[PDB]
Every structure is written in structure tokens, then in C-alpha cells.
Amino acid sequence: KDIDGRKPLLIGTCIEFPTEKCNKTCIESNFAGGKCVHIGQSLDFVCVCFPKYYI
């Protein structure tokens, strides 16, 4: 897998899209799924997907 895949996609805040939905939403988006993580020190959870077919 020589795919760099370095373009995460934010859909919403983990508030509206918890861990379960977050990833599921990312799956249908054609991404390697997603998760809930904090930003720098904003302690704000967000749903971000990962590249999979980005060539």
C-alpha cells in the first residue's frame, strides 16, 4: 500500500456523531472509517474519517 492517504475528512462533532455512528458514517463515505479525537488542546471531540481510495 503505497497510498499516502493523508487527507482526513471532518463530518461533524462527536456530539452529533458518536464513535459508533462516526465511523459508520465514514465507512459509507468511502473512507477507512473514522473516530472521535481531540484537537491540540481544545479538548473538543470531532468525527474525522481516513483516506482509503485516495490515489
From Swiss-Prot:
Entry keywords, A to Z:
Antimicrobial, Disulfide bond, Fungicide, Plant defense, Secreted, Signal
Subcellular location(s) per record:
Secreted
Q: Which cysteines are joined by disulfide bonds?
A: C14-C36, C22-C47, C26-C49
Q: Specify where it is mainly localized.
A: secreted
Q: According to the lineage, what is the superkingdom?
A: Eukaryota
Q: Which GO terms describe its cellular component?
A: extracellular region
A Gene Ontology biological process in which this protein takes part is: killing of cells of another organism
Q: Which family does it belong to?
A: Belongs to the DEFL family.
Q: Under what name is this protein listed?
A: Defensin-like protein 32
Give the originating organism: Arabidopsis thaliana
Instruction: Quote the range of the complete protein represented.
Output: 27 to 81 of 81
